Design a protein around this ligand. Structure first.
Ligand code: NI
Length: 341
């Protein structure tokens, strides 16, 4: 059965609620983004209307085979009526196609559901500037002050400089980048661009990237592994065993691997600056863990919420323990007393 925080009061609508079977009273199912925890339950046998971005729509049709008649894509930054209710989709600064949804309820209440997001000051000049929000359904993944990490720009600067240095010293090194979902594509795209290479990958991953509306993508990626010195591999293969095994397959073209594992936050964030990050090394194989986040830091979250001044907050992440729920409520009360709403 569908939990409360996935229902939108005063509407026939749910958000990211496909794993509960037919939800009683649901006339339209919203999908914020194409990540498996959120789409869990969709397939070619789904026969209710799905509302989402154009990009999420491309992925539902091609990767999950949802039939076209049930896919309803909406443009961003545009007032749309759905089953007699005004809605707007906004860029969430998460993975490709990810949105936040503004719902303008028939009774005058305004609700923002962030989906998954990485809060940014640019959001303070979207259509959010224009009006009040009574309820905020908030991505609270990193809602605790220990969660610090650098900007995406600094993380990419580090990865580019690391890769370019290593391959310039050794033209016979291969670069490998881990992936398990959409998102974080800038890591592998930026590295390939500095090196003058296309990114090589499996047929399945190539298919997924071809759904994303990335400008000039055909110039950036390929299934021909042999032409490419930046390869993508599933994240589970990014270890000394997996990588040895991959170097065997390359037919003595390369004598060194440098690999990148994009993670979210890890505890080594609490001590080490991005500049000072070092790899794990065994022989001619090195592996860097880099903290490229597509979710708000604590400070980014706090800034957004203090700016929006919502009347009520409903967390959508870390909701399963009493201690988590209590901790989050404490921070919402400080933020409110500090800013005066
Ligand atoms: Ni996500």
């Amino acid at each position: 059965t569908c939990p409360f925080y996935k229902k939108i009061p005063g509407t026939g609508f749910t958000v990211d609620a496909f794993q509960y079977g037919v939800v009683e009273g649901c006339t339209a199912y919203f999908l914020t983004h194409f990540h498996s925890d959120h789409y869990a339950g969709l397939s070619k046998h789904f026969t209710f209307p799905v509302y989402c971005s154009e990009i999420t729509g491309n992925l539902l049709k091609n990767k999950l085979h949802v039939q076209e008649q049930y896919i309803h894509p909406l443009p961003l930054d545009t007032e749309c009526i759905v089953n007699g209710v005004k809605v707007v989709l906004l860029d969430a600064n998460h993975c490709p196609g990810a949105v936040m949804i503004l719902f303008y309820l028939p009774n005058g209440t305004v609700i923002l559901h962030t989906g998954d997001f990485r809060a940014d000051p640019s959001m303070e000049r979207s259509l959010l500037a224009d009006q009040k929000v009574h309820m905020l359904y908030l991505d609270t993944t990193y809602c605790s002050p220990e969660y610090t990490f650098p900007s995406q720009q600094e993380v990419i600067r580090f990865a580019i400089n690391t890769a370019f240095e290593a391959v310039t010293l050794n033209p016979h090194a291969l670069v490998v980048c881990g992936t398990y979902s959409i998102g974080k594509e800038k890591v592998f795209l930026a590295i390939a661009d500095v090196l003058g290479s296309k990114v090589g990958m499996s047929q399945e991953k190539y298919k997924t990237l071809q759904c994303l509306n990335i400008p000039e993508i055909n110039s950036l990626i390929t299934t021909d592994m042999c032409s490419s010195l930046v390869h993508l591999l599933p994240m589970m293969q990014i270890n000394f065993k997996g990588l040895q095994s991959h170097l065997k397959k390359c037919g003595g073209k390369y004598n060194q691997i440098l690999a990148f594992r994009p993670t979210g936050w890890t505890h080594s964030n609490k001590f080490t600056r991005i500049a000072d990050v070092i790899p794990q090394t065994k022989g001619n194989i090195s592996i860097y863990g880099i903290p490229y986040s597509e979710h708000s830091s604590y400070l980014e979250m706090k800034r957004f919420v203090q700016w929006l001044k919502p009347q009520k907050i409903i967390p959508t992440v870390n909701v399963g323990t009493w201690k988590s729920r209590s901790t989050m409520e404490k921070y919402f009360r400080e933020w409110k007393l500090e800013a005066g709403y």
